[PDB]
Amino acid sequence: SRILAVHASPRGERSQSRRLAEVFLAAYREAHPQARVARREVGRVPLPAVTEAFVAAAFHPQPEQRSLAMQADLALSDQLVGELFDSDLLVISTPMYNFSVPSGLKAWIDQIVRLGVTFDFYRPLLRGKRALIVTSRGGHGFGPGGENQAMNHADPWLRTALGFIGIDEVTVVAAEGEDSCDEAEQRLLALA
Amino acid sequence: SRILAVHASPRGERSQSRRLAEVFLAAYREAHPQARVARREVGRVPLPAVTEAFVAAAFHPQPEQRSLAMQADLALSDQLVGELFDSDLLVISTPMYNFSVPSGLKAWIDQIVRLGVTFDFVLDAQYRPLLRGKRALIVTSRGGHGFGPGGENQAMNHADPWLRTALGFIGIDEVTVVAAEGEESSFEDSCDEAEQRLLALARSA
Ligand SMILES: Cc1cc2nc3c(=O)[nH]c(=O)nc-3n(C[C@H](O)[C@H](O)[C@H](O)COP(=O)(O)O)c2cc1C
Ligand SMILES: Cc1cc2nc3c(=O)[nH]c(=O)nc-3n(C[C@H](O)[C@H](O)[C@H](O)COP(=O)(O)O)c2cc1C
Numbered sequence: 154s155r156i157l158a159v160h161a162s163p164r165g166e167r168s169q170s171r172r173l174a175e176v177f178l179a180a181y182r183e184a185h186p187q188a189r190v191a192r193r194e195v196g197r198v199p200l201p202a203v204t205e206a207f208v209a210a211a212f213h214p215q216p217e218q219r220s221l222a223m224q225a226d227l228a229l230s231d232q233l234v235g236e237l238f239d240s241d242l243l244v245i246s247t248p249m250y251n252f253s254v255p256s257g258l259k260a261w262i263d264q265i266v267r268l269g270v271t272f273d274f275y276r277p278l279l280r281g282k283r284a285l286i287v288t289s290r291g292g293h294g295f296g297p298g299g300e301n302q303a304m305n306h307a308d309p310w311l312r313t314a315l316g317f318i319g320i321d322e323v324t325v326v327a328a329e330g331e332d333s334c335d336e337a338e339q340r341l342l343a344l345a
Numbered sequence: 346s347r348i349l350a351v352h353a354s355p356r357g358e359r360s361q362s363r364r365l366a367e368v369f370l371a372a373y374r375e376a377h378p379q380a381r382v383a384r385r386e387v388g389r390v391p392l393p394a395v396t397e398a399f400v401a402a403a404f405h406p407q408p409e410q411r412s413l414a415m416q417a418d419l420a421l422s423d424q425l426v427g428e429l430f431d432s433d434l435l436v437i438s439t440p441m442y443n444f445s446v447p448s449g450l451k452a453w454i455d456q457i458v459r460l461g462v463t464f465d466f467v468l469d470a471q472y473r474p475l476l477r478g479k480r481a482l483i484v485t486s487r488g489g490h491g492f493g494p495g496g497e498n499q500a501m502n503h504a505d506p507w508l509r510t511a512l513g514f515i516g517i518d519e520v521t522v523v524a525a526e527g528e529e530s531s532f533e534d535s536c537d538e539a540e541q542r543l544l545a546l547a548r549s550a
């Protein structure tokens with residue numbers, strides 16, 4: 154199983170979402186020694202936002218006739234999509250930032266949801282892929298049945314976006330109160 | 346009554362959310378010649394993302410003791426927050442990108458939600474908003490249909506509903522949403538309706 158790990162926290166050593174994700178990846182590597190891991194940093198690296206140029210090229214009515222300039226505008230997107238195609242398991246580590254994800258992760262999603270590549274018209278085009286979302290939160294009760302579940306626009310939105318392109322087998326492991334981390338940690342070891 | 350307009354679409358003349366928002370601002374201008382209008386571009390301008398240095402600065406236990414480097418890391422945030430404090434009405438124009446907002450608008454939000462400035466907390470964490478007496482108008486454009494209340498795809502909409510939650514957290518709980526749908530394809534009717542709604546809001550604000 155080939156893995157694509159997308160880290161969304163701008164923090165490095167201090168990132169809990171990053172740490173917990175690495176705990177899973179390490180535990181998984183031991184259980185599957187032949188596994189490959191590709192890491193795509195979107196937290197500590199400023200992934201470019203969608204531009205009007207991107208929109209013109211991505212939604213170009215006839216893709217084959219794109220100019221070299223248009224292809225250049227889509228070069229990063231193609232690289233990012235390719236990493237996704239080449240993977241079997243998608244691991245996303247992300248904090249909750251203002252009831253959603255950090256802007257860098259939104260930028261990544263906006264690059265890999267591509268007409269005619271990951272979706273068409275609406276139907277998904279990705280198949281046989283699973284996702285694991287490892288998230289960290291300062292507050293409490295954003296999970297299923299929580300007092301503040303309706304305010305959660307982070308992982309539940311990722312489900313929607315990922316589901317739209319065909320990734321419908323998604324698991325979310327969440328730590329709150331920043332004991333919950335230990336539960337998350339142990340949970341992740343079992344999954345690996 | 347002072348207005349802050351935040352445009353989130355990367356498109357210019359062809360941005361429908363920008364166009365509709367400008368219809369409101371112009372109509373408002375006609376009814377209030379003395380009113381001040383400030384524009385903050387987050388769509389055609391790449392707003393910096395929250396970094397680790399920003400987190401270290403914004404959550405510093407003794408904010409008075411921040412080094413000049415730390416203050417530099419917060420200089421943009423301080424400017425963005427200030428524009429908001431100076432405003433009575435906030436106008437956000439935004440597309441729906443992949444069931445949420447463009448990353449640039451998310452970045453703007455992440456800059457203006459600030460500990461001890463736009464929100465605070467005490468330990469008993471019990472959060473408190475610090476903005477008062479302000480209102481917001483969200484003008485949005487969508488390619489598909491049914492993302493509004495009662496719509497078939499309502500549960501998929503993580504854009505304007507999410508903006509409501511984030512804005513409410515810092516104290517802006519009076520929020521109006523004007524949406525146009527079917528841009529991908531009727532749309533002329535949706536736009537005309539949104540226009541009439543905005544012209545009415547402008548005349549009465
Ligand atoms: C800019 C910013 C926004 C945040 N917004 C929320 C939030 O909306 N809800 C919440 O529960 N925690 C919020 N937090 C707290 C973080 O989610 C929490 O500290 C988390 O552990 C960070 O994960 P990390 O260690 O991987 O960086 C926020 C933190 C920052 C820096
Ligand atoms: C990257 C991208 C993602 C989009 N995602 C959605 C979507 O999830 N749902 C939808 O109804 N329309 C979606 N659209 C269509 C836009 O919402 C629509 O074209 C809108 O009018 C753009 O706003 P603007 O005219 O202000 O630029 C998307 C468009 C782009 C370019």
Ligand SMILES: COC1=C(OC)C(=O)C(CC=C(C)C)=C(C)C1=O
Nearest residue numbers: 251252291292293301458460472514
């Ligand atoms: C920095 O910004 C924010 C936090 O920082 C720690 C939070 O914990 C939270 C969590 C709030 C709840 C209701 C527990 C929010 C919402 C937030 O915006």
